[model samples]
Target: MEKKHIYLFCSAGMSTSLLVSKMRAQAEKYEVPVIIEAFPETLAGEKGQNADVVLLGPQIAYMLPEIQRLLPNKPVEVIDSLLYGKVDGLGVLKAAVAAIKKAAAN
Candidate 1:
């Protein structure tokens, strides 16, 4: 797979920072690259435009619709509650890959 840029957005960019680190740790397994980052939802329309896949924290799940509208070309997904709450980084990496693939197919 080619290098992918994945972003995780939250309401305030606090707790989600940890999630980014966890996900970054798993990126090394990739053959090409997987660049992960976390940001406040406020940046979704701007800085987020480069993301190949975007994951939203449950705290700001309500913003999903607007975000999708803002980034029609990218796949925007709400991080699964179970995996997100548990801080399952690898789980999110898998989900992000799926989201990117699904979006590409459309």
Candidate 2:
């Protein structure tokens, strides 16, 4: 499978950086081929344009519809708030992988 690019967006995009590391670790452990990065929501149109999957931070969960519109035909979802609070990389990774797989199936 090709390497998937997962882009995460938050308010400042800084808080999600830690989540990115955690997700990367889990991806490695599971042998999932992916590249994850955190960026401010402002760059969603810029950087997120190339993402195979786009995840919105809990804080910006409300932006889901807007992002979906901005990146039509792309898989876009908001990370679970509880998972984000706990920094659950494994859970997030699973969600991301599922999203990409679903997208590919479609």
Candidate 3:
């Protein structure tokens, strides 16, 4: 499979930074070429354009509709508040993997 670019966005990039680390590690364990990174959601319009799947932090979960408008072909999801709080990289990875394998059902 092609390398997947997993872009994660939050109100501020800081919140998802740790999750990025965890998720990146998970990717290595699985040995997948998935590039996971966090960016401030405000950059979603441009930065998110090329993402294989976009993960949004709950703080800006409200921006989902807007992002979908801008990047209609890209798969997108808001990280569950509880999952984000728990730093559930594995869970997010599951959702992301599905997004890539399926027709953006995420």
Candidate 4:
């Protein structure tokens, strides 16, 4: 499988920072080829251009439409608030991969 770049965006940078690490850990654990990172929402159109999948932090969920606009061709979705609050890395990673897979299928 090709290594995927999963970019995460949040309000500031701190909130999604921890989530990135968690997501990376899950990827490593499963031996999945993926690149996960977090950035402030301000860079959604810049740093996010290369992402295979873009996930937004729940706090910035309202910016979904705008983000989709910037990354129109990419899969963009907001991480579930419950999963974010619990720091569920595996869940988020699964979400990203699932989106990627679905996009590829279509």
Candidate 5:
């Protein structure tokens, strides 16, 4: 099976890297085929275009719309503020998958 690519963006990519680790752990626990990466906020448009799903960190929530516009066909959303602040990887994973599935259905 092919792995799904999930791209995460933030101001400096620091916090998102930590979140990536957490998400990776959850993905491994569930045996989900996925690749998650953190990108600097400025590169979101470019990097996000190649991803199956693009997630913006809470700190960069305002960039969601612009990212979505850049990758209109891809699933793009802001991580839940509470979940992101808490680094709730599983919750973010669930939401990401759901968003991707919804986009696929459309």
Candidate 6:
């Protein structure tokens, strides 16, 4: 099966890149096929439009609404503060799945 694409955005993309690694580790451990990448804040809209789901780091949390508008059909959300701070890959993945599910239901 193909992996689900998840794009993450933040102020600099550095910290989120670390988060991506953690998320990938969890994905592998759980046998969840996922492709996660980090992007600079400026590319969030463009990259997000092509993603199955988009998660914003806390540093960019304030831009959620605008990002959502830019990618109207995609699931976009802010990473939970706790998850963001701790780089909790499994938790973030669960949140991403829930976000996408909610978007699908609507």
Q: TM-scores of the models, in the given order?
A: 0.89, 0.93, 0.89, 0.93, 0.91, 0.89
lDDT of 5: 0.85
Q: What ranking emerges by TM-score with the best candidate at the front? A: 4, 2, 5, 3, 6, 1
Put down candidate 5 lDDT per residue, 1-106, tens digits, no spaces.
8898888888888878878899999999999999989889788777777888888877777777777778888888888889977888999999988888888874
Residues 48-93, candidate 3, lDDT per residue (tens digit)?
A: 8888889888888788999889889888888888888899888888
Off by over 4 Å in 4: none
Please list the Cα RMSD from the true structure of every candidate, rounded to 1 decimal place.
1.9, 1.4, 2.0, 1.4, 1.4, 1.6
Clashing pairs in 4: none
> Clashing residue pairs in candidate 6, if any?
none
Q: After superposition, which runs of candidate 6 have C-alpha atoms over 4 Å from their true positions?
A: none
Candidate 2 achieves a global lDDT of 0.90
lDDT of 6 by residue, 1-106 (tens): 7667888888878877777898888888888887888889789777877888898888778888888888888878888888777777789889887777787675
Please write out the lDDT profile of model 4 over residues 3-66, one tens digit for every residue. 8899888877887888889888888888999989888889999988888899988878888998
Worst 10-residue lDDT window, candidate 1: 24-33
Cα lDDT of model 3 overall?
A: 0.85
Angstrom error at residue 90, model 5: 0.6
Backbone clashes for every candidate come to 0, 0, 0, 0, 0, 0
lDDT for 10 (candidate 4): 85
State how far residue 12 of model 2 sits from its true place (Å). Answer: 0.9
Give candidate 1 misplaced runs (Cα > 4 Å): 29-32
